[PDB]
From Swiss-Prot:
Record note on modification: Phosphorylated at Thr-153 by CDK7 in a CAK complex. Phosphorylation at Thr-153 promotes kinase activity, whereas phosphorylation at Tyr-15 by WEE1 reduces slightly kinase activity. Phosphorylated on Thr-14 and Tyr-15 during S and G2 phases before being dephosphorylated by CDC25A. Nitrosylated after treatment with nitric oxide (DETA-NO).
Domain of life according to the entry: Eukaryota
Protein name, entry field: Cyclin-dependent kinase 2
Active site: residue positions: 120 (proton acceptor)
N6-acetyllysine, modified sites: 6
Positions of post-translational Phosphothreonine modification: 14, 153
Catalytic activity: L-seryl-[protein] + ATP = O-phospho-L-seryl-[protein] + ADP + H(+); L-threonyl-[protein] + ATP = O-phospho-L-threonyl-[protein] + ADP + H(+)
Stated regulation of activity: Phosphorylation at Thr-14 or Tyr-15 inactivates the enzyme, while phosphorylation at Thr-153 activates it.
Co-factor: note: Binds 2 Mg(2+) ions.
Modified residues (N-acetylmethionine): 1
Entry cofactors: Mg(2+)
Cellular component terms per the entry's GO annotation: Cajal body; centrosome; chromosome, telomeric region; condensed chromosome; cyclin A1-CDK2 complex; cyclin A2-CDK2 complex; cyclin E1-CDK2 complex; cyclin E2-CDK2 complex
Length: 287
């Protein structure tokens, strides 16, 4: 490319490496992602150039050159995974949990209003600044290519944040998949512990059943007709959420419960969740 100077590698996303880089012409400091290459990828990333929102990482340009796709992004400060790790002793304060959950729902509501799914929400894919904003990153190829099992580095793509409709092998995905993922992140921010740390598809599903109870045709009409559903699934009782995410207050447990509804058609929308009593006292603090 020979137009930007790489200052440092800052990450490996699902599809490619990411560099802090400095535009040699504009002095501009960017995040530069490089994906090794097909034409469908390029056309899909181009639609992202229009998906602008304060809670989506700003895509500044897309360059198809030399069997490579470079994405130029605005430069933020750290991923949420690092901030959660850094905070494991103290715990992220609630108003900041509340602020971040508010902003992510705002980002999802925008995406979902334009029928764009993230499909791979997780702390690794959320970027914060010093200003106390949080942003959706690493999405837009999922509609076309789905979610790979592994990264370009052959790292395992975590299942901890996958909706059960996906794990049970439904091949048509609603916006509800993102709400599940965000519910998982919410609980993790509170408890400083992954809600459903599965290491396999069936291990992920059984962790979900152990906490929320095994779904049946009552809670989830059609579920036992899912492609990968087995009548031989063990039948666990639903657990008290007071056990699951202490010491989250009643409004939090109630929002979370609606975010982890088994039936994607009963699961709260981004837009509904923004109206939830849990956000009545919402503010905007910083790390």
């Amino acid at each position: 490319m020979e137009n930007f100077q790489k200052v440092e590698k800052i990450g490996e996303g699902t599809y490619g490496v990411v560099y802090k880089a400095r535009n040699k012409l504009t002095g501009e400091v960017v995040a530069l992602k490089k994906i090794r290459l097909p034409s469908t990828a390029i056309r899909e990333i181009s639609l992202l150039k229009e998906l602008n929102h304060p809670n989506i990482v700003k895509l500044l340009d897309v360059i198809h050159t030399e069997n490579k796709l470079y994405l130029v992004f605005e430069f933020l400060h750290q991923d949420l995974k690092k901030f959660m790790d850094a905070s494991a002793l103290t715990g992220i304060p609630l108003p900041l949990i509340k602020s971040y959950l508010f902003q992510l729902l705002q980002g999802l509501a925008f995406c979902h209003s334009h029928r764009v799914l993230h499909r791979d929400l997780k702390p690794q894919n959320l970027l914060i600044n010093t200003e106390g904003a949080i942003k959706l990153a690493d999405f837009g190829l999922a509609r076309a290519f789905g979610v790979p099992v592994r990264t370009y580095t052959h790292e395992v793509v975590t299942l901890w944040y996958r909706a059960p409709e996906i794990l049970l092998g439904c091949k048509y995905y609603s916006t509800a998949v993102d709400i599940w993922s965000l519910g998982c992140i919410f609980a993790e921010m509170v408890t400083r512990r992954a809600l459903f740390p599965g290491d396999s598809e069936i291990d992920q599903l059984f962790r979900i059943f152990r906490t929320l109870g095994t779904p049946d045709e009552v809670v989830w009409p059609g579920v036992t007709s899912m492609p990968d559903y087995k009548p031989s699934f063990p039948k666990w009782a639903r657990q008290d959420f007071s056990k699951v995410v202490p010491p989250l207050d009643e409004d939090g447990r109630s929002l979370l419960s609606q975010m982890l509804h088994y039936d994607p058609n009963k699961r709260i929308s981004a837009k509904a969740a923004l109206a939830h009593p849990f956000f009545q006292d919402v503010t905007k603090p910083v790390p």
